[PDB]
Design a protein around this motif. Structure first.
Motif, PDB file in Angstrom:
ATOM      1  N   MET A  55       0.820  -1.201   0.000  1.00  0.00           N
ATOM      2  CA  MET A  55       0.000   0.000   0.000  1.00  0.00           C
ATOM      3  C   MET A  55       0.855   1.252   0.000  1.00  0.00           C
ATOM      4  O   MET A  55       0.491   2.243  -0.639  1.00  0.00           O
ATOM      5  N   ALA A  56       1.993   1.230   0.684  1.00  0.00           N
ATOM      6  CA  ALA A  56       2.866   2.389   0.640  1.00  0.00           C
ATOM      7  C   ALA A  56       3.301   2.705  -0.774  1.00  0.00           C
ATOM      8  O   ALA A  56       3.683   3.844  -1.050  1.00  0.00           O
ATOM      9  N   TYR A  57       3.264   1.730  -1.675  1.00  0.00           N
ATOM     10  CA  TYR A  57       3.439   2.065  -3.081  1.00  0.00           C
ATOM     11  C   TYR A  57       2.162   2.646  -3.646  1.00  0.00           C
ATOM     12  O   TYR A  57       2.127   3.801  -4.073  1.00  0.00           O
ATOM     13  N   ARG A  58       1.092   1.856  -3.637  1.00  0.00           N
ATOM     14  CA  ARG A  58      -0.117   2.231  -4.347  1.00  0.00           C
ATOM     15  C   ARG A  58      -0.624   3.606  -3.949  1.00  0.00           C
ATOM     16  O   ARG A  58      -1.435   4.185  -4.671  1.00  0.00           O
ATOM     17  N   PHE A  59      -0.160   4.159  -2.828  1.00  0.00           N
ATOM     18  CA  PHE A  59      -0.398   5.574  -2.587  1.00  0.00           C
ATOM     19  C   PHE A  59       0.495   6.444  -3.460  1.00  0.00           C
ATOM     20  O   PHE A  59       0.026   7.410  -4.066  1.00  0.00           O
ATOM     21  N   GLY A  63      -0.261   9.696  -5.782  1.00  0.00           N
ATOM     22  CA  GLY A  63       0.333  10.955  -5.409  1.00  0.00           C
ATOM     23  C   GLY A  63       0.355  11.240  -3.928  1.00  0.00           C
ATOM     24  O   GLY A  63       0.905  12.269  -3.524  1.00  0.00           O
ATOM     25  N   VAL A  64      -0.217  10.375  -3.107  1.00  0.00           N
ATOM     26  CA  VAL A  64      -0.184  10.545  -1.662  1.00  0.00           C
ATOM     27  C   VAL A  64       1.110   9.949  -1.142  1.00  0.00           C
ATOM     28  O   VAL A  64       1.376   8.759  -1.334  1.00  0.00           O
ATOM     29  N   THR A  65       1.915  10.766  -0.479  1.00  0.00           N
ATOM     30  CA  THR A  65       3.156  10.266   0.085  1.00  0.00           C
ATOM     31  C   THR A  65       2.874   9.178   1.106  1.00  0.00           C
ATOM     32  O   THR A  65       1.950   9.285   1.915  1.00  0.00           O
ATOM     33  N   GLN A  66       3.687   8.125   1.062  1.00  0.00           N
ATOM     34  CA  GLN A  66       3.456   6.931   1.859  1.00  0.00           C
ATOM     35  C   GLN A  66       3.448   7.200   3.355  1.00  0.00           C
ATOM     36  O   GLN A  66       2.843   6.428   4.101  1.00  0.00           O
ATOM     37  N   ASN A  67       4.082   8.275   3.820  1.00  0.00           N
ATOM     38  CA  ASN A  67       4.059   8.537   5.250  1.00  0.00           C
ATOM     39  C   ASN A  67       2.651   8.710   5.771  1.00  0.00           C
ATOM     40  O   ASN A  67       2.423   8.568   6.975  1.00  0.00           O
ATOM     41  N   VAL A  68       1.682   8.873   4.871  1.00  0.00           N
ATOM     42  CA  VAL A  68       0.267   8.915   5.340  1.00  0.00           C
ATOM     43  C   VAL A  68      -0.132   7.504   5.790  1.00  0.00           C
ATOM     44  O   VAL A  68      -0.661   7.382   6.905  1.00  0.00           O
ATOM     45  N   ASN A  72      -1.534   6.275   9.349  1.00  0.00           N
ATOM     46  CA  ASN A  72      -2.970   6.052   9.329  1.00  0.00           C
ATOM     47  C   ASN A  72      -3.342   4.596   9.115  1.00  0.00           C
ATOM     48  O   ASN A  72      -4.512   4.308   8.852  1.00  0.00           O
ATOM     49  N   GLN A  73      -2.368   3.687   9.171  1.00  0.00           N
ATOM     50  CA  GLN A  73      -2.596   2.294   8.803  1.00  0.00           C
ATOM     51  C   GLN A  73      -3.844   1.721   9.459  1.00  0.00           C
ATOM     52  O   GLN A  73      -4.722   1.182   8.777  1.00  0.00           O
ATOM     53  N   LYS A  74      -3.939   1.826  10.785  1.00  0.00           N
ATOM     54  CA  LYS A  74      -5.099   1.290  11.490  1.00  0.00           C
ATOM     55  C   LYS A  74      -6.390   1.887  10.961  1.00  0.00           C
ATOM     56  O   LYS A  74      -7.311   1.164  10.573  1.00  0.00           O
ATOM     57  N   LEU A  75      -6.469   3.214  10.945  1.00  0.00           N
ATOM     58  CA  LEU A  75      -7.663   3.888  10.451  1.00  0.00           C
ATOM     59  C   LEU A  75      -8.006   3.453   9.036  1.00  0.00           C
ATOM     60  O   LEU A  75      -9.182   3.377   8.669  1.00  0.00           O
TER      61      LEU A  75
END
Ligand SMILES: *[C@@H]1O[C@H](CO)[C@@H](O[C@@H]2O[C@H](CO)[C@@H](O)[C@H](O)[C@H]2NC(C)=O)[C@H](O)[C@H]1NC(C)=O
Ligand SMILES: *[C@@H]1O[C@H](CO)[C@@H](O)[C@H](O)[C@H]1NC(C)=O
Ligand SMILES: *[C@@H]1O[C@H](CO)[C@@H](O)[C@H](O)[C@H]1NC(C)=O
Lengths: 197, 91
Positions: A55-59, A63-68, A72-75
Motif C-alpha cells: 500500500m505504501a506504493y499504491r499511494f 500521489g499521496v506520500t506513503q508517510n500517510v 494512518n494504517q489502522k484507520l
C-alpha cells in the motif's frame, strides 16, 4: 424445464470449457497474487512483499506520500474492512446490481424462447406440425406447404442467429473491457481516471 | 391398443396425441379432467396413460453433436469420439 424443451428441438447448450470451480481458482490466484506479491506477478515472477508495504506504493501511485499510510494504517484498516462489510449487505438485498448479468442471461433465454415458439407458427402454411401437413395431403402438395414452413423457420433461425452474432460482439467488447480492467486495474494500478471507478 | 413401453425410446400415440419420446413414471399430479401436461415451450411434456391413469413424462430420445477428437492426422490416424450430452448406453 426450459433447457429440456430446447434440448428437445435441436437446441443444445454446450458446457463452458471452464467450470465454476476452475474460474474460482483463477480469481483465487489473481486475488492471492495481488495480496502477497504486489502487482509484479503480471510482469514476471511474483515477488513476496509485505502487504502493508504494497500500500505504501499504491499511494505513491495516486500521489499521496506513503508517510500517510504507516501513520494512518489502522484507520485505513477499519475503513477498508468496514467498506467490505457494506458490500455484502448490498448484495444480500440487491437484485439490481447484477442487472447487467441478469439481463444477459435473460436476453439469451428470451431469444431462445422466441426461437422455440416459432416452431408453433403457421407461417402461412396450413399447420405448424410438420407431419400433420403430410398425412393430411398427398406429398406433391406438401412439397409446396413445407416451403412456407421451411422458409419460415429457416428465416427465424437467421433472425436468431444474426441476433446472437450482434449480441456476441456486444459481450465481445465487454469481455475486452474486462481483460483491460483485469490487466490494468487488478495486475497494475491504473493511472487512468474513473476507469476503475 | 398396444402395450406401453417404459424407459425405452418409443414412437407413440395416446388418444390421438402423437410424438416420440422416452416414457417414464412421473410424480407430477394432474387435475382429474385434464389430459396433457405441457412445458414452457408449448411442447408436450407429460401425458397421462388413458387405460391405467398414470403420469408419464415424455423426454424425446437423447441426441447430441458427435465430436471427433484427434491429434493432427500428422501424428496419428487414431481418433477419440465424444458423444455430447448423452449418458453412456445408446452407443
Ligand atoms: C479522519 O476521519 C476518520 C473518520 O473517517 C476519523 O476517525 C474517527 O475518529 C473518531 C474520533 O474523533 C473516532 O471516534 C472514530 O472511531 C474514528 N473512525 C474510525 C473508522 O476509526 C479520524 O480521526 C480523522 N482524522 C483526521 C486527522 O481528521
Ligand atoms: C508433422 O509431420 C512432419 C513431417 O511430415 C514433422 O516434420 C512435424 O514435426 C510434424 N508435426 C508435429 C506437431 O508432430
Ligand atoms: C446414467 O445411467 C446410469 C444408470 O443407467 C446412472 O447410474 C447414471 O447416474 C446416469 N448418468 C447420467 C448422466 O444420466
Amino acid at each position: 424445464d426450459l433447457i429440456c424443451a430446447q434440448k428437445f428441438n435441436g437446441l443444445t447448450v454446450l458446457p463452458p470449457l471452464l467450470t465454476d470451480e476452475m474460474i474460482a481458482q483463477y480469481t483465487s490466484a489473481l486475488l492471492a497474487g495481488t495480496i502477497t506479491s504486489g502487482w509484479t506477478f503480471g510482469a514476471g515472477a511474483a515477488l513476496q512483499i509485505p502487504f502493508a508495504m504494497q500500500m505504501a506504493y499504491r499511494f505513491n501511485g495516486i500521489g499521496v506520500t506513503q508517510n500517510v499510510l504507516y501513520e494512518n494504517q489502522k484507520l485505513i484498516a477499519n475503513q477498508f474492512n468496514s467498506a467490505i462489510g457494506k458490500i455484502q449487505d448490498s448484495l444480500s438485498s440487491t437484485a439490481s446490481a447484477l442487472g447487467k448479468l441478469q439481463d444477459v442471461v435473460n436476453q439469451n433465454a428470451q431469444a431462445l424462447n422466441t426461437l422455440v415458439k416459432q416452431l408453433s407458427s403457421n407461417f402461412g402454411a396450413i399447420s405448424s406440425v410438420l407431419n400433420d401437413i403430410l398425412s393430411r395431403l398427398d406429398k406433391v402438395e406438401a412439397e409446396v406447404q413445407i416451403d412456407r414452413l421451411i422458409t419460415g423457420r429457416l428465416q427465424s433461425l437467421q433472425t436468431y442467429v444474426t441476433q446472437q452474432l450482434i449480441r456476441a460482439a456486444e459481450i465481445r467488447a465487454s469481455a475486452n473491457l474486462a481483460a483491460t480492467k483485469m490487466s490494468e486495474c487488478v495486475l497494475g494500478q491504473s493511472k487512468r481516471v474513473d476507469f476503475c471507478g | 391398443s398396444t402395450n406401453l413401453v417404459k424407459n425405452k425410446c418409443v414412437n407413440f400415440n395416446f388418444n390421438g396425441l402423437t410424438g416420440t419420446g422416452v416414457l417414464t413414471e412421473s410424480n407430477k399430479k394432474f387435475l382429474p379432467f385434464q389430459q396433457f401436461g405441457r412445458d414452457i415451450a408449448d411442447t408436450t411434456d407429460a401425458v397421462r396413460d388413458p387405460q391405467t391413469l398414470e403420469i408419464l413424462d415424455i423426454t424425446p430420445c437423447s441426441f447430441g453433436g458427435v465430436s471427433v477428437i484427434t491429434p493432427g492426422t500428422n501424428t496419428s490416424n487414431q481418433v477419440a469420439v465424444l458423444y455430447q450430452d448423452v449418458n453412456c448406453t445408446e452407443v
